[PDB]
Amino acid sequence: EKNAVRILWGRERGARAMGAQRLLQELVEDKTRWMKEGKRVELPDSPRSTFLLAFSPDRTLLASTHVNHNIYITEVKTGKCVHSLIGHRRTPWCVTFHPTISGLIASGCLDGEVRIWDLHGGSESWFTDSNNAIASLAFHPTAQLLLIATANEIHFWDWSRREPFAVVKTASEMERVRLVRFDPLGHYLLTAIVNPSANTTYRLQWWDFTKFDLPEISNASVNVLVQNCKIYNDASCDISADGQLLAAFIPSGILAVYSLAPHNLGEMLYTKRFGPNAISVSLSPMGRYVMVGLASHMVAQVFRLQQAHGGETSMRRVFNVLYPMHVSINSARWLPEPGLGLAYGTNKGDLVICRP
Amino acid sequence: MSYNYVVTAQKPTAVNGCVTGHFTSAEDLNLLIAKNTRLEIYVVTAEGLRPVKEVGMYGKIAVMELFRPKGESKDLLFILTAKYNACILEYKQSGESIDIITRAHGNVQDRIGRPSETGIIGIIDPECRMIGLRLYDGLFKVIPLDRDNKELKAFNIRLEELHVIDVKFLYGCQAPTICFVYQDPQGRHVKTYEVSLREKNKGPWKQENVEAEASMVIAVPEPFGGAIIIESITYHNGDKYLAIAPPIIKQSTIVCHNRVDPNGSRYLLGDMEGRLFMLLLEKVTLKDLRVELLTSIAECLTYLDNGVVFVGSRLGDSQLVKLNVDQGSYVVAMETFTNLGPIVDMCVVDLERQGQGQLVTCSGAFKSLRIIRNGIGIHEHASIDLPGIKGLWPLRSDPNRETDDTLVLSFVGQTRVLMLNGEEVEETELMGFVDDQQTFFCGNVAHQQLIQITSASVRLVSQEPKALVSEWKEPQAKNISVASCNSSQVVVAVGRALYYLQIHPQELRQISHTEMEHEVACLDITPLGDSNGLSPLCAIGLWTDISARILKLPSFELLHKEMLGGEIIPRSILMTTFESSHYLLCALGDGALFYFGLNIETGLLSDRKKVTLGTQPTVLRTFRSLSTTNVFACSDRPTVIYSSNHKLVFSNVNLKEVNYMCPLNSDGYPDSLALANNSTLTIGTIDEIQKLHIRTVPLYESPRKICYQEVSQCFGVLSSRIESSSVSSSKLTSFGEEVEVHNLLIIDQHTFEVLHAHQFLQNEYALSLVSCKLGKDPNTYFIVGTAMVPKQGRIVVFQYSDGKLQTVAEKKGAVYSMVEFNGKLLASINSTVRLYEWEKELRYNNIMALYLKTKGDFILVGDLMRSVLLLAYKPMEGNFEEIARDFNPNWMSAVEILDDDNFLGAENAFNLFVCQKDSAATTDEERQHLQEVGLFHLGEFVNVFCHGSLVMPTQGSVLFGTVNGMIGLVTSLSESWYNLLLDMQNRLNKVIKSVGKIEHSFWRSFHTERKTEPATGFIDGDLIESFLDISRPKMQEVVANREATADDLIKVVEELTRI
């Protein structure tokens, strides 16, 4: 029965026929696709733009970067701006929360400065040797580590020490390291590197960091999963909470879903065609619905996976999410728990949390 | 200003794990039941199951398996708390005091893991070289079992099979070998790996394909080698292949499995339909497989020994079946536990229209009503169909050798003496009294003599001579109205005059004679202290003035008196000592009971309180159930006057009507007590005053709700089966669909026999039932909601009649829930609230509901979508208004309202939170947010909330049933008492931290996987109730640093245990 009751009757009756909780959250996502608001939040200052939302793993707070060279921290429930991280002389480019240690957040700016912040008190800062622009950041969930990529150099630094330990560089200077990210399990590492020559093409290499071996990313033909992918920021690709799903742009922007399970790793499950305005993607916690922010009302869209064959009809359009006002979506992401809603940032300098 | 108090009355009883081992000792096999939050340690014997230590550990058990490490004398136990608080437990066996010493502890929780779909399981290497826990998908956490690593420093190993159904370790291999079936999207497969410690591989056989409906794994032991995957039971070991496809198995699925013998020639498989299968194997390489058919539903089977199989049921009453080798079936039940499991709902009913209430539950499912009360129950032994008796008192017709062998029954004008030569009840009169005269006392005093105090004359008959020795009568030819004689003195009252007689050797001698202002109503002389039969004081009552006075027995001189209102004469008065302070009981003829303290030296007028009782006259009597004697009240509402620390309780009794009572100590009835009524004779023992008694009545169906009927005196229960009477006539489909057959069983409240069954349509899930008085019609209804899943919905107004159910009206989609508000039904479902009313018919915001509850007030609490919603009904507007909606969404399970401010609540993560309108600003811009003024983690799946209480400084109460069968109470209280007690709330941490070295605040935290916040104002009642269990030498140093008295707080807290 497609009811909350019978599934729950089996649950409350102590019959541990698991998978029901999965199905129940499948239903509420289906249920929440029908319900309809735009709630704003005040800010201590008036930044021109809002960039790079990043949700907490404990959902206690929410960091965000703004052009005012400050980072605002807001609580999701109250919607009240509590903390405003200040200290970057330049606008930060990458902000990532810490899965294990609560309140320890890092942020790196275009001037080559990284700043590890703590809400309770204290902070650390390190300087790149040639103050180059920072590309992407990726915290290590289990191991005490944060990887730093600036142009083509991967910096292996432990914040318990002042200076990075290991230095690994690509085959060429122009072979830039654009994006780095661990998976929600910390077993595999995805490295985005520009292809040798806008039509700037990038490739994804799939390094196993289980043994913490330094990835020899100079080779462009080892552990490659995607030959060509369009990447502009760190939010253009993301991994589902379960870790068995992945979304990434491909050129003719075509969003395609690739199974991360080893049995059919790299196999293309679901696909749809999108215009150039597609920027960032985000997967629902149970790997069924995808949120995508769009550039210029219809600013966002949600889809649902029905059958995996690689064709266009893999998903079906569900509905649209609007904002109570050109406006182009910079960042968006599904809230950690399914069905709560979504938060996003605005190029005009707005942070709005939408709920049904 | 609003601070709660959570306490549990009945602990959970659903079974979750039955792993067997040698935890208690190497030479004593145990069974290790694991309830939701407490593990019961039993020892299995020939008789059955015997609890040895019922340790309630502060955690929710999820993974639990006994293993034997190398160099360990006894097998350890690995409890994995549902919050990943992994601990290697070890039973500490020292002496009378037994605790659970933690060998190693540590939160193995993973900040990035996601629990696997098919639950959480853990396995141990056969050679104890490794511990393997399957917490997250594709994350096989491995804990080495070296003598080091007391902090349980675990590490993660990736698995290729992301989705794993069941995993075990194959026997008979050098390296750690693992066998498991996964669900890659090509049927179902099996794989093998060699787990490497240092490296952190390949197995004996490669990956093959098996049936897509095979999920369970049975790894055979060393002599055979290999694994059995479970209408297809295969076997796999290297290249050898076997498979069978029996037709019987195709009917349903199999859920239980475990090895039977070390040889591997027999196995157990449990079906979902209560069928006990029996797997066989023929003997190296085997030849072929075979299946056999030989019970209630089983959740985890555990073959104990010699054909004893424990059928652990999370769906119903867990059984203890026997498998006999010799209808020709081999499934016979020996034991059936009273485990209330899926408590789907309940309601509070006062069947006898007395102060106490009752609970009727709907336990079990598929293949349901049980009665929950709070009074002390009595198990009847012998029944005699005798007429009304004017009194009851045991008689010792034998010499001073303890016990008794004779019973004295007093009629209206006759006295029938009964002899009990064991279990027989024969009326035999002794030649020492008069059988044609009413006797007020037929007991024994001393000198082997039985005092026969009758209305005509007091008689004293020796037990040995079996004849009257002396007879004392008033020298006025007047009938004796009130008499009293305990062990050595007689205080009888005739008219307005009273005479005192001494129980001398074979002679009666008058000692005092005095007259009172009014006629004496009752006389009671009993030692309340250091007195061996000779009562110093003597109580006397008045009818014209209705007053109670205390006088010295030897001289009949009044000492003090207390005035009383009204004109009802006191039915009975008694004074006795049951605690450090003696108490005096005064009972009126209408049933009013006055309890006041008494002093053995002076007898000053202490504090007096009015305690309600039955409408019939009450005769006070003491009972010996435990070491501390209690008093019992016989009236239309019988009650037992027990105590907890220093105050007298008034717990009810399990009987219809009581006219007289008398203790019994005969050889055939050691702890029985005589009971009298209009025409009845029952016996009972009673041990406590807090046990809950359960009466069962199976229905073999799946119920949804229940409501009581006050004018027809019969319950109603929904039925939904899968395959007097009535059939629906709804005049307003593939072969294989989802259709259920529904009924409505009307259970009589007297005979517990169903009287009707209203069969409904096919493919229509009706799961609602409400009893109310809709509109101005005096007729009382059985309103039942019917839902099909949804473009239609109808409601049958089951207007009950003499023998036939009727319908008044029928009235777009499936309605969700509604109970009567005041006299109407205006439901809130399908994203549209209603304004309905009762022509005998039942004749917009996007408001849809899942659970709904309200007190008699206009205040209403509901839920739109995963949020506690508070709604107010404005009579001027006649609709619903959203007052304050709780944010921070939680997956709610049951909702209740404590008072106008505090809103109790629960959610599926086993947590309780209370909302309250704390003062705020901005007129109405943040008041719509209900700031959580409390956070508490209970550990149970609260299912139904209901008001009422099982007893007659909070104002209100609440009960909640769980999915595991736990009942409890929640109160509220101001900040003044809370804040003062807040400082000493954590005082108990020092004397004891936890059972598995767990932080106190960690249980005070909000254990949801996202948040963690210490309890805010939720005062526990479980920990404080354990304050009285702390030993006296240990109780001294706690709360020791205004008078700072040792027992000052105990009195302040002993009032909490009476809630």
Residue numbers in the entry:
A (entry chain B): 6 to 41, 43 to 203, 856 to 910, 919 to 962, 973 to 1001, 1008 to 1038
B (entry chain A): 1 to 200, 203 to 232, 235 to 287, 295 to 305, 308 to 339, 343 to 383, 386 to 741, 762 to 770, ...
Article excerpt on this structure:
AMBRA1 is a tumor suppressor protein that functions as a substrate receptor of the ubiquitin conjugation system with roles in autophagy and the cell cycle regulatory network. Damage-specific DNA binding protein 1 (DDB1) is a component of the Cullin4A/B-RING E3 ubiquitin ligase (CRL4) complex and functions as an adaptor protein between Cullin4A/B (CUL4A/B) and CUL4A-associated factors (DCAFs) to target substrates for ubiquitination. AMBRA1 limits CDK4/6 activity by mediating ubiquitination and degradation of Cyclin D1 as part of the CRL4DDB1 E3 ligase complex. DDB1 has three seven-bladed WD40 β-propellers (referred to as BPA, BPB and BPC) and a C-terminal helical domain (CTD).
Based on HDX information, a truncated construct comprising residues 1–204 directly fused to residues 853–1044, referred to as AMBRA1WD40, was designed for cryo-EM structural studies and then co-expressed with the DDB1 E3 adaptor in HEK 293F cells. We next determined the structure of AMBRA1WD40 complexed with DDB1 by cryo-EM. The overall resolution for the structure is 3.08 Å, allowing visualization of the large side chains in the reconstruction. The structure of DDB1-AMBRA1WD40 showed that 4 individual beta-propeller domains cluster with each other, with the longest dimension of ~130 Å. AMBRA1WD40 is characterized by an N-terminal helix-loop-helix motif (E6-K41) and a seven-blade WD40 β-propeller domain that packs against the BPA domain of DDB1. WD40-N adopts Blades I-III and the first two strands of Blade IV, while WD40-C contributes to the latter two strands of Blade IV and the remaining Blades V-VII. In AMBRA1, this several-residue long loop is replaced by the 650-residue intrinsically disordered region that separates the WD40-N and WD40-C parts. The N-terminal helical motif is almost entirely engulfed by the large pocket formed between BPA and the BPC double propeller of DDB1, stabilizing by the hydrophobic interactions contributed by W953, F1003, V360, L814, and A381 of the BPC domain with V10, L13, and W14 in the first helix of AMRBA1. Additional DDB1-AMBRA1 interactions include the ionic bonding of AMBRA1 D64 with BPC R1080, AMBRA1 H929 with BPA D184, and AMBRA1 D866 with BPA R158 in the loop regions. 3D classification without alignment analysis demonstrated that this domain can adopt different orientations relative to the BPA-BPC double-β-propeller fold for substrate presentation.
